[PDB]
Design an enzyme around this catalytic site. Structure first.
Site, mmCIF file in Angstrom:
data_model
loop_
_atom_site.group_PDB
_atom_site.id
_atom_site.type_symbol
_atom_site.label_atom_id
_atom_site.label_comp_id
_atom_site.label_asym_id
_atom_site.label_seq_id
_atom_site.Cartn_x
_atom_site.Cartn_y
_atom_site.Cartn_z
ATOM 1 N N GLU A 48 1.809 3.321 10.825
ATOM 2 C CA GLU A 48 2.526 2.558 9.836
ATOM 3 C C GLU A 48 3.643 1.856 10.507
ATOM 4 N N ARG A 49 4.103 0.747 9.878
ATOM 5 C CA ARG A 49 5.108 -0.113 10.443
ATOM 6 C C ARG A 49 6.401 0.636 10.447
ATOM 7 N N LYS B 91 0.883 -1.139 0.000
ATOM 8 C CA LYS B 91 0.000 0.000 0.000
ATOM 9 C C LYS B 91 0.916 1.182 0.000
#
Lengths: 470, 53, 501, 469
Positions: D183-184, D157
């Protein structure tokens, strides 16, 4: 008058709770009237919650109410007017002339509630009612004093089907009729008022052979519930007290079901399956049981039902499916086939179809038809992939006959001279049995399929064959 | 020769058809089964919500 | 100038008297306050929070009266006093709302100076009875050929635009507004429709573009744009259709004929869902409160074709329902379908197929009205429906490797041409007088032979040809509205003449 | 005097304070509870009356002793803005999480602000070229627009967005905001490094980008107001600096998702699929404070992590309402191996029009849609029977569409690392030509394998020669 005065405590939509003073507590199912600049708001007592507070359902819009507003009690369930002075005027939920016919009532009023006649009262019937609508006559004959049931979905020209019944059967029948509309449009209303004035059933000179009770969808859900009861009591007065044959028509009972579901939530009753009231079975039951032909007069009710999104597995149509004597399904597919009547023949079952009731000949003709149509439907899949190949010649003739029969069931409606233009045909029941018999024998397999389409009896079918031939 | 080839070819074709259709059955079956469970879940959520109120 | 106007505004502030009723906020937040006091209080009254917020009152409880804010939470604080406005919700209604974008309250949000209002009205007004109505005898033609022919639209009648979201969902409606320019330009008040486009739940950017589009096509000068943008309060959104309705009723009352687009009615339902869930009413099916059906039904039935005695004033309605997932089995679409007098299903696949309009005619009906279309156009499109139905049947049969016979392919070939004939580009309304020829040609199969690619060319050119020679013929179609023998023959000869060249 | 309080409850991260003195709290105020772990910032969200607030707590609520002293800092959390935001990655409060020390500020601005008025709106449509063939062809973006992506579960994404950042924002000179909600972290560090490397962040110089980054680890409440913080930074550029901004948001599903977590605890009866009953208002506020006004044109890019890969879920549904372009990317098209995974029948833009990208573009698009719609239609027949059993005329359409499907995969430059295939940026002018040719069947005469994962039409020709070898 008794000083049964309550002060409103909570206006929370239709639910309005009242706080009657100590020792003067109303009784459940009483009727409260509250003076308002809206006339009198009627609240139907539906629970006691103790501490001198009732929880009642409104019959009129609860906007602009005052928390603490004095409430007189007129007691018992709403008392409508009854008579033959209820013939021919539009009577609203609480009974008021919504057509300005001035005072309505003969000498009597009756309560909206009434008990359903006991098992002892019930008197068996097994008459016949010829509708002239060929599909109805052959494949699911109605019976006078019945509990006919017009299951169909949204916009199956549901009103139109009923309109045909009124046009023929009502004028023909000597019995009074009551057209009751529960939650139907004022567009439909103005048309119906006008149309039945035109058909003269409502004769604005002489007595009308029909009464109107128009409850519309713009009325609050609470009022919508008790449109049904009001109409029912007018019918009961005819059935019982005037002793007359009745030919009731009510519209649409999904609106009754739906209305009850809505106020169920409001009453605080934890929603049951598919959000319907947990009292669904019994509420339906009270309405359905009340309508019956007893030792007293024969109510020939025709009850409309709306099947949401043509899903009959939904509990609300499915529960009603049991309760009505002579089910008919008017399906979308058949409408789309261009066939008006939209009656789905294999999905129309009647307890009145029997080899005794309408005799062996009628039965046998219809049995052959049912098998023939079912064969055509079963074979449709084979035709879809395999086509005319490994499919029998005999089967192909049966398929051809089924297409002819399918469109032989197509015959116009007189009240669809405006929704078509070809005038309907009231084909005699005996004549229809004969004419369909001929088709099955294949005596008219030289007649085009489209020469069965949207025309009357065999004589007409031949005439349209000639017309097409030219 | 031609007719024999036609009939032979259709036998081969209809056999292969049966296999491909079978795969589609399995795929819609899994979808059906999951969907059936999901309907129950969706109904349950409405019930829980009602009970909570 | 600006100084004098400011001087007037300050001058217009002066004095006050004892304020009846008070009550103190306690629990409050979410947008739903609950105040203690307000013993006298009408239901649905507007109550002025001392923060500045105004809020309608939706719960009267023997505890704490629940006043739904129409303003921001941050303004409100604990134990604030609220003093009752003393008015059940009401809207300014007038002629001046024509040419105005207005928010739910009715203040111009386009700020073309404060509205000129001939009255105020109340937001909840019950539907006109059986007694004040006439049956629909006045067409209103959208200028989209598929719509006029297949699903005839008549004044009064509620006709439901339903289908997958923003697939030009707004654009279908806007086309109607644009063709109502043609009457607007014209004369005779009862032959004019004023137009109220109601926009609920849409982003400011979409709305701003929309008002810009209307100004671009210079169709802004007879419109009222009622707006409740996406940011705006869920209470204001719930109230928004009902306050649009009253503005419409001012037309209806005047005997004026007008049309109200309720786009998206689906967003009203979301609003009522929120409203109910923070009034803690037991939640209905899919968490929409059960009386959502009641809400929508009362709203929609206010539009009507009145009786001749009651001035005929036809408010016409077009609800627009977004269909999430394209499944109308959802509670809100099912409810609306029952309420509305027709359904105009639009399908996404057909949009992709390049049928624009993408309206699926198999699912589109106008269950009532047929004196809702021009007699001429009815005659020509008599078998347009039949041919199309046959085309659909034949095309269905053709699938799965069935080798069609020539007779079926006559239908198929004829059918394909009709499909190409229907298509119309967004924001390109047409004159009905020049839609009657196109259908005549198609139905009388003159286009059947004509090559599929150049049908669009034929359409354009044919219209030009009719403009060139048979402009007398077009004038007659406008004048008499039913095709005479002379017109049918003239039209037949003309059509024949243009088949080649 | 100090609006002291005690912590009456600590029910999850929805602490409730009970203010002693009858000095009022106010909704959306911020409170500082000083903790030996440093301060904890809470935000008043409900008034329960009788001087008991119920407060969302941004950071973790572990350790709190029931009856903990409070001080009310008053008003919503105040970020620090300036040019110094550029080249700094900031915590929700605004503290540098990249540890670049004190961010000198001029104005510190409230996280909450009102959506600019209907009057202030301004609409435009200057076609932005992304150099991605599928994007340009099907639904070109345009300046000031609100761009939308409805990517599936970890379909890269972020990767799609990264390519866009690499292209569009280095072709944009004005300010740009990167806001990454939940978010990671590791990917964020990679992003931070990449930006520094590509000089967009130049720590020595000035950066034409500023960044707010919210780790997926961070407590739900912080993630809820990460958006509002970023949104303020954007407003400062839009308004105060005036310069045309850009904005990237990933994922705005996290904004909704976080909201769904807090709502229940907050005291709300939740709507279907558990979603917050305040979903519409909250989404509404966020998306109407992002807009192109007279003050400035802010092109915004919003990414939706479709939950469970169901786009009919209410959270994706309300996103569709507030966008000017969408480019739904779905797992199925990804499985087919087509990178990018944009669904070609589920892309739309209001920026696709014959009066925008010209009649020729619109005509080209019409044919692309028609071919693909046919191709999808015959998927049933294709499976049940053989592809040879398809009608011959249709079989040509199918073959063309099969080619079109393969053609649309264009190697990306950030993907170039991962795929290994060197990236391809194809001009918009080139794209119209390339597809036009395919529609005229010019280069339809060479394998599907040739069309697969390559750039422009010319590149296909060269690749045909390569394939031929």
């Amino acid at each position: 008058s008794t000083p049964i005065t309550g002060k409103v405590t909570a206006v929370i939509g239709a639910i309005v709770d009242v706080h009657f003073e100590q020792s003067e507590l109303p009784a459940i199912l009483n009727a409260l009237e509250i003076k308002t600049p809206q006339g009198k708001l009627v609240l139907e007592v539906a629970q006691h919650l103790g501490e001198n507070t009732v929880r009642t359902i409104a019959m009129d819009g609860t906007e602009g109410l005052v928390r603490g507003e004095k409430v007189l009690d007129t007691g018992g369930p709403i008392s409508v007017p009854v008579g033959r002075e209820t013939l021919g005027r539009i009577i609203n939920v609480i009974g008021e002339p919504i057509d300005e016919r001035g005072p309505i009532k003969s000498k009597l009023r009756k309560p909206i509630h009434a008990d359903p006649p006991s098992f002892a009262e019930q008197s068996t019937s097994a008459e016949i009612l010829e509708t002239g609508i060929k599909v109805v006559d052959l494949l699911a004959p109605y019976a006078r004093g019945g509990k006919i049931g017009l299951f169909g979905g949204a916009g199956v020209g549901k009103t139109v089907f009923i309109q045909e019944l009124i046009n023929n059967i009502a004028k023909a029948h000597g019995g009074f009729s009551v057209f009751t509309g529960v939650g139907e449009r004022t567009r439909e209303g103005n048309d119906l008022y006008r149309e039945m004035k035109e058909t003269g059933v409502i004769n604005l000179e002489g007595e009308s052979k029909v009464a109107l009770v128009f409850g519309q969808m713009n009325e609050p859900p609470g009022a919508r519930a008790r449109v049904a009861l009001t109409g029912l009591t007018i019918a009961e007065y005819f059935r019982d007290e005037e002793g007359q044959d009745v030919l009731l028509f009510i519209d649409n009972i999904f609106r009754f079901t739906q209305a009850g579901s809505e106020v169920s939530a409001l009453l605080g009753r934890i929603p049951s399956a598919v959000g319907y009231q947990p009292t669904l079975a019994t509420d339906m039951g009270l309405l359905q049981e009340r309508i019956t032909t007893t030792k007293k007069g024969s109510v020939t009710s025709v009850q409309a039902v709306y099947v949401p999104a043509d899903d009959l597995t939904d509990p609300a149509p499915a529960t009603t499916f049991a309760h009505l004597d002579a089910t008919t399904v008017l399906s979308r597919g058949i409408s789309e086939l261009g066939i008006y009547p939209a009656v789905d023949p294999l999905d129309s079952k009647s307890r009145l179809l029997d080899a005794a009731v309408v005799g062996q000949e009628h039965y046998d003709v219809a049995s052959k038809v049912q098998e023939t149509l079912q064969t055509y439907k079963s074979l449709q899949d084979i035709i879809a992939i395999l086509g005319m190949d490994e499919l029998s010649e005999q089967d192909k003739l049966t398929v051809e006959r089924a297409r002819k029969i399918q469109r032989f069931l197509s015959q116009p409606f007189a009240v669809a001279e405006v929704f078509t233009g070809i005038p309907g045909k009231l084909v005699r029941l005996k004549d229809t049995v004969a004419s369909f018999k001929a088709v099955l024998e294949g005596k008219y397999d030289n007649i085009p399929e489209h020469a069965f389409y949207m025309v009357g009896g065999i004589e007409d079918v031949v005439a349209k064959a000639e017309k097409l031939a030219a | 020769q031609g007719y024999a080839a036609e009939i032979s070819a259709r036998r081969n074709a209809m056999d292969n058809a049966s296999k491909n259709a079978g795969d589609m059955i399995n795929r819609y079956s899994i979808l059906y089964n999951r969907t059936r469970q999901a309907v129950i879940t969706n109904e349950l959520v409405d019930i829980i919500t009602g009970a909570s109120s | 100038e600006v100084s004098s106007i400011l001087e007037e505004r300050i001058k217009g502030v002066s004095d006050e008297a004892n304020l009846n009723e008070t009550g103190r906020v306690l629990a409050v937040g979410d947008g739903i306050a609950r105040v203690f006091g307000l013993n006298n209080i009408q239901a649905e009254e507007l109550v002025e929070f001392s923060s500045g917020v105004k809020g309608m009152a939706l719960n009267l409880e023997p505890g704490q009266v629940g006043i739904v804010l129409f303003g921001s939470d941050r303004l409100v604080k604990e134990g604030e006093l609220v003093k009752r406005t003393g008015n059940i919700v009401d809207v300014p209604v007038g002629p001046g709302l024509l040419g105005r974008v207005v928010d739910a309250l009715g203040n111009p949000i386009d700020g073309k100076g404060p509205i000129d209002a001939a009255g105020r009205s109340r937001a909840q007004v019950k539907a006109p009875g059986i007694l004040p109505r006439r049956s629909v005898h006045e067409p209103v033609q959208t200028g989209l050929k598929a719509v006029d022919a297949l699903v005839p639209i008549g004044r009064g009648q509620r006709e439901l635009i339903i289908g997958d979201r923003q697939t030009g969902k707004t654009a279908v409606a806007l086309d109607t507004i644009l063709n109502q320019k043609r009457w607007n330009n014209g004369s005779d008040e009862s032959k004019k429709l004023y137009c109220v486009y109601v926009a609920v739940g849409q982003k400011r950017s979409t709305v701003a573009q929309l008002v810009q589009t209307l100004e671009q096509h210079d169709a802004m000068k007879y419109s009222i744009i009622v707006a409740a943008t996406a940011s705006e309060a869920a209470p204001l959104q719930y109230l928004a259709p009902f306050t649009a309705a009253s503005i419409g009723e001012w037309f209806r009352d005047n005997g004026k004929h007008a049309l109200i687009v309720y786009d998206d009615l689906s967003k009203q339902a979301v609003a009522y869902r929120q409203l109910s869930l923070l009034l803690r009413r037991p939640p209905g099916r899919e968490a929409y409160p059960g009386d959502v059906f009641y809400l929508h039904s009362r709203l929609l039935e206010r539009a009507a074709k009145l009786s001749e005695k009651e001035g005929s004033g036809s408010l016409t309605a077009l609800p627009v329902i977004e269909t999430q997932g394209g499944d109308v089995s959802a509670y809100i679409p099912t409810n609306v379908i029952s309420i509305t007098d027709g359904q105009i299903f639009l399908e996404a696949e057909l949009f992709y197929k390049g049928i624009r309009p993408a309206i699926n005619v198999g699912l589109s009906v106008s269950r009532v009205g047929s004196a809702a279309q021009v007699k001429a156009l009815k005659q020509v499109a008599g078998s347009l429906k039949l041919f199309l139905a046959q085309y659909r049947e034949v095309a269905a049969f053709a699938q799965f490797g069935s080798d069609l016979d020539a007779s079926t392919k006559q239908t198929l070939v004829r059918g394909e041409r009709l499909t190409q004939l229907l298509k119309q580009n967004q924001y390109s309304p047409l004159a009905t007088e020049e839609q009657v020829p196109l259908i005549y040609a198609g139905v009388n199969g003159h286009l059947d032979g004509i090559e599929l690619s150049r049908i669009g060319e034929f359409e354009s050119s044919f219209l030009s040809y009719l403009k060139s020679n048979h402009n007398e013929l077009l004038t007659e179609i406008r004048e008499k509205g039913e095709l005479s023998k002379e017109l049918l023959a003239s039209l037949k000869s003309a059509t024949e003449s243009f088949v080649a060249t």
